[PDB]
Amino acid sequence: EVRDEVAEKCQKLFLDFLEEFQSSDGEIKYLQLAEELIRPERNTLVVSFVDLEQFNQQLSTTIQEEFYRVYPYLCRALKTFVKDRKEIPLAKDFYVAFQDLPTRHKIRELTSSRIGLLTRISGQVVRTHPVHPELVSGTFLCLDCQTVIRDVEQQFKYTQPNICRNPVCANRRRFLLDTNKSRFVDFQKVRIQETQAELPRGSIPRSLEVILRAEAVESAQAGDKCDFTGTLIVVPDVSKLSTPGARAETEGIRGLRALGVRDLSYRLVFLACCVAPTNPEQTAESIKNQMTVKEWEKVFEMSQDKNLYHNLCTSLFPTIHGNDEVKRGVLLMLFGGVPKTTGEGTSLRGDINVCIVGDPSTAKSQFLKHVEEFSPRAVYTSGKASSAAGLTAAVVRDEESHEFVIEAGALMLADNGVCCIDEFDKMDVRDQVAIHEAMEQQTISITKAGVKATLNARTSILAAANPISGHYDRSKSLKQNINLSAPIMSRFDLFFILVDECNEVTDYAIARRIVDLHSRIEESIDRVYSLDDIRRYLLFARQFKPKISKESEDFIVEQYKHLRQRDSWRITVRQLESMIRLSEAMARMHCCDEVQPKHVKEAFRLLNKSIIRVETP
Amino acid sequence: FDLIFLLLDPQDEAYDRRLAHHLVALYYQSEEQAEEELLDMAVLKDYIAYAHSTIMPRLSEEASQALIEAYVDMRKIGSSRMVSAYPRQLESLIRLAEAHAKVRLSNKVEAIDVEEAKRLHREALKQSATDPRTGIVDISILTTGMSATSRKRKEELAEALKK
DNA sequence: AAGCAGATATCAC
DNA sequence: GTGATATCTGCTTTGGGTGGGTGGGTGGGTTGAGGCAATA
Ligand SMILES: Nc1ncnc2c1ncn2[C@@H]1O[C@H](COP(=O)(O)OP(=O)(O)OP(=O)(O)O)[C@@H](O)[C@H]1O
Ligand SMILES: [Mg+2]
Numbered sequence: 001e002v003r004d005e006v007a008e009k010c011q012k013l014f015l016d017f018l019e020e021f022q023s024s025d026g027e028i029k030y031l032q033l034a035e036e037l038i039r040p041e042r043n044t045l046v047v048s049f050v051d052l053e054q055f056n057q058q059l060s061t062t063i064q065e066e067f068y069r070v071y072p073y074l075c076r077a078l079k080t081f082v083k084d085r086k087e088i089p090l091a092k093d094f095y096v097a098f099q100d101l102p103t104r105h106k107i108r109e110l111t112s113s114r115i116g117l118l119t120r121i122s123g124q125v126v127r128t129h130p131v132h133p134e135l136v137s138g139t140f141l142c143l144d145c146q147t148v149i150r151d152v153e154q155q156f157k158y159t160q161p162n163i164c165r166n167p168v169c170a171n172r173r174r175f176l177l178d179t180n181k182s183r184f185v186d187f188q189k190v191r192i193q194e195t196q197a198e199l200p201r202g203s204i205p206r207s208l209e210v211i212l213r214a215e216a217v218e219s220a221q222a223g224d225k226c227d228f229t230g231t232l233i234v235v236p237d238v239s240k241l242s243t244p245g246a247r248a249e250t251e252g253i254r255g256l257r258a259l260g261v262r263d264l265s266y267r268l269v270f271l272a273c274c275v276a277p278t279n280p281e282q283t284a285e286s287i288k289n290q291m292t293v294k295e296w297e298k299v300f301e302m303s304q305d306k307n308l309y310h311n312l313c314t315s316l317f318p319t320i321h322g323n324d325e326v327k328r329g330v331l332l333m334l335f336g337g338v339p340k341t342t343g344e345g346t347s348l349r350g351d352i353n354v355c356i357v358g359d360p361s362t363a364k365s366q367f368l369k370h371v372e373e374f375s376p377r378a379v380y381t382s383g384k385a386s387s388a389a390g391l392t393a394a395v396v397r398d399e400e401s402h403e404f405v406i407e408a409g410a411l412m413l414a415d416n417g418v419c420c421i422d423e424f425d426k427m428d429v430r431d432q433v434a435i436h437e438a439m440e441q442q443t444i445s446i447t448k449a450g451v452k453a454t455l456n457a458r459t460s461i462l463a464a465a466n467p468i469s470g471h472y473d474r475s476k477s478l479k480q481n482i483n484l485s486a487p488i489m490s491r492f493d494l495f496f497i498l499v500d501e502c503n504e505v506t507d508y509a510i511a512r513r514i515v516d517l518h519s520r521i522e523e524s525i526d527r528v529y530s531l532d533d534i535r536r537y538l539l540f541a542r543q544f545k546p547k548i549s550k551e552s553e554d555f556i557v558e559q560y561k562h563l564r565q566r567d568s569w570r571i572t573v574r575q576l577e578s579m580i581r582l583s584e585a586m587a588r589m590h591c592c593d594e595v596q597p598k599h600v601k602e603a604f605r606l607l608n609k610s611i612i613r614v615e616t617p
Numbered sequence: 618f619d620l621i622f623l624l625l626d627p628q629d630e631a632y633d634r635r636l637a638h639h640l641v642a643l644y645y646q647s648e649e650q651a652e653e654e655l656l657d658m659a660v661l662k663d664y665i666a667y668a669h670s671t672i673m674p675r676l677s678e679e680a681s682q683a684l685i686e687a688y689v690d691m692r693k694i695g696s697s698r699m700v701s702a703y704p705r706q707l708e709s710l711i712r713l714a715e716a717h718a719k720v721r722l723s724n725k726v727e728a729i730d731v732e733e734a735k736r737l738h739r740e741a742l743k744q745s746a747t748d749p750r751t752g753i754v755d756i757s758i759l760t761t762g763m764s765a766t767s768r769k770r771k772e773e774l775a776e777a778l779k780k
Numbered sequence: 781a782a783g784c785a786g787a788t789a790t791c792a793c
Numbered sequence: 794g795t796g797a798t799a800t801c802t803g804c805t806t807t808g809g810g811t812g813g814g815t816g817g818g819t820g821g822g823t824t825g826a827g828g829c830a831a832t833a
């Protein structure tokens with residue numbers, strides 16, 4: 001059989017690269033990575049193109065110019081490099097991915113001259129299709145002689161063997177496909193679009209079809225901005241091609257036997273071997289392991305700091321002057337309580353909701369923005385919404401299908417995170433009624449035409465509101481200043497007010513702070529802890545589930561009795577559970593395993609100042 | 618909105634005559650004048666492009682003190698008698714000041730830029746923040762959407778109906 | 781009517 | 794006498810409603826009237 005010299009040389013050199021390339025530490029970089037390919041779910045190896053370029057520049061150039069031609073041989077080299085380990089079945093297939101290609105091309109630079117070369121592009125995913133199994137090499141039985149033919153390559157069309165393997169056999173038409181000994185690969189089709197940055201001025205966006213295979217399937221989601229590394233190929237019009245096993249199914253080139261009197265056109269698709277984001281079962285021990293040693297000692301030092309509450313408060317909100325209590329409340333919301341389930345299967349809410357009622361231009365939006373920028377999972381939205389979904393689900397009809405579907409709202413998109421809601425007093429009646437269940441039961445229930453669903457809304461809500469008159473009236477109570485109903489107010493753990501103090505000194509402090517922030521953007525900010533440090537510390541601290549002790553039990557019971565005796569707003573069991581949640585969050589803040597009385601004292605201070613502020617002018 | 622402007626139609630006869638002469642002259646404008654205006658527009662476009670390319674103004678110390686004093690005075694106006702300003706307006710001033718510095722092709726924001734920003738902001742407010750009944754200083758119409766006099770009148774009506 | 785799949789007789793070497 | 798290779802024969806096609814809505818609208822067909830949810 002004729003032998004492709006270039007591809008074989010590439011295979012040999014790639015095997016050498018895999019075996020010999022050395023990391024900084026002196027170990028073989030890719031031996032330890034290939035050691036992971038013994039698992040059944042893992043079949044792809046990610047190789048940095050810069051490492052390969054350092055090892056051998058001629059090999060890298062040959063791969064770049066003949067990627068489509070030589071890729072199967074690189075996969076064969078990987079198979080050889082993995083063959084030693086006993087756990088791999090002989091039937092397993094392995095694939096190579098290439099990570100860091102120095103140069104990038106635009107979607108409108110994908111011309112015919114790029115067919116078969118290694119390329120990297122960026123795009124916004126518009127649509128993802130279901131996963132399929134795709135045949136790569138078929139095993140067939142010959143019906144004339146019962147000989148078994150293996151490794152029949154497929155070319156965009158279901159192909160059967162051309163001639164029987166047996167020299168005596170002359171069969172050309174009768175074969176049987178055997179699925180159990182054939183080879184399949186995972187297959188996914190995605191449709192991507194030009195990013196808004198790349199879209200030329202006054203031009204309709206240009207779309208592209210990308211094919212993901214093996215591990216790359218289900219790794220990109222619609223709306224994501226992703227970098228794809230792979231190759232540009234042509235895909236013929238399969239509908240025109242006729243084969244012994246497959247009839248044709250209802251200008252281009254003419255003259256192929258499989259074409260009859262028909263024409264064959266082509267279209268360009270991108271065959272991606274690697275997908276990444278364009279801009280890039282937990283437990284305390286695993287969280288620790290994910291961190292480096294420096295980060296772990298920083299987290300421990302943070303846990304040991306005796307001024308942690310104040311340092312965290314100042315670090316999180318450096319641009320805001322004053323309002324220390326509001327910062328403390330928002331921090332406690334960020335740490336959260338311990339969600340629990342009862343013996344009968346019902347849930348006890350562990351999340352904390354906070355409300356901030358403010359005068360105009362009092363920086364409540366600043367609080368919401370700080371939390372939104374800090375939190376990994378956080379959604380910022382307005383009470384008055386642009387879409388029909390709003391803060392909860394909506395039911396909309398697909399015109400073509402006539403089917404009814406759920407459109408998700410803000411509280412659904414923020415599930416397991418934080419929802420910052422601005423202008424919380426402008427909600428509509430549908431959202432107003434649904435938010436009862438959303439805030440307490442943490443679910444949204446729908447029984448409408450074509451839809452019957454319970455949707456998860458396990459969220460912590462941080463809300464910002466305006467007073468009814470547009471200016472806060474100290475003579476009245478907080479309940480008298482806002483338009484929130486009493487049942488909604490009972491669902492909030494903490495309430496805060498921000499009043500415009502018509503004071504010269506406060507005005508002078510705020511003006512100096514703003515002007516200093518603008519004059520020296522970098523120099524103005526001074527955080528005891530960096531935001532990344534706080535993110536790691538919060539990730540570590542959320543793994544603790546402090547237990548309520550007996551003394552804390554007695555203190556909580558006494559405080560609840562006092563609150564009820566003191567008192568359409570009223571002290572309900574919700575205040576008791578809010579106090580429990582706040583105590584749990586206070587204990588969590590110090591990575592502690594038991595809720596001590598001190599945490600209860602602090603939580604009761606905050607909650608008592610919230611309740612009194614709700615009641616009296 | 619940083620600036621709100623009011624384009625009112627006057628009842629003056631002299632304004633009508635002047636605008637009529639303006640429009641008739643435009644109706645008879647010659648081709649050389651049109652070409653000259655096109656050239657001036659091209660110069661303006663090039664100037665703006667260059668300024669966006671290479672100018673990044675920064676606040677000097679004198680500009681910072683000017684801005685702080687400006688905000689304090691705007692607050693004082695209301696504090697003398699209500700509220701006559703809110704911190705967001707200060708931000709607007711900064712933006713405007715920087716814009717002015719960019720017009721000069723200057724990398725430093727000076728006191729002249731702050732003065733121009735104050736003048737422009739104060740003119741826009743005098744155009745659009747005026748209460749038809751009493752005066753201008755009241756900015757509560759922007760913050761709350763209801764005139765202070767209207768708020769007092771509604772409070773009186775509600776109290777009387779509660780009587 | 782138009783064209784591919786299958787069957788089969790037929791030239792040539 | 795075997796390997797092409799030229800001739801002959803039978804299948805089914807079309808989009809279509811006597812080929813079904815107990816095939817399915819991700820296999821593809823204007824126009825109007827009729828329920829929904831969100832709407833005002
Ligand atoms: N206490 C404060 N400390 C620092 N900056 C403040 C403070 N109060 C207001 N500001 C400034 O005011 C602006 C914040 O306005 P923001 O949009 O957050 O107000 P708001 O409370 O949402 O009001 P509204 O919704 O009525 O506009 C920023 O310039 C912020 O610097
Ligand atoms: Mg705001």
Ligand SMILES: [Zn+2]
Nearest residue numbers: 142145164169
């Ligand atoms: Zn055979």
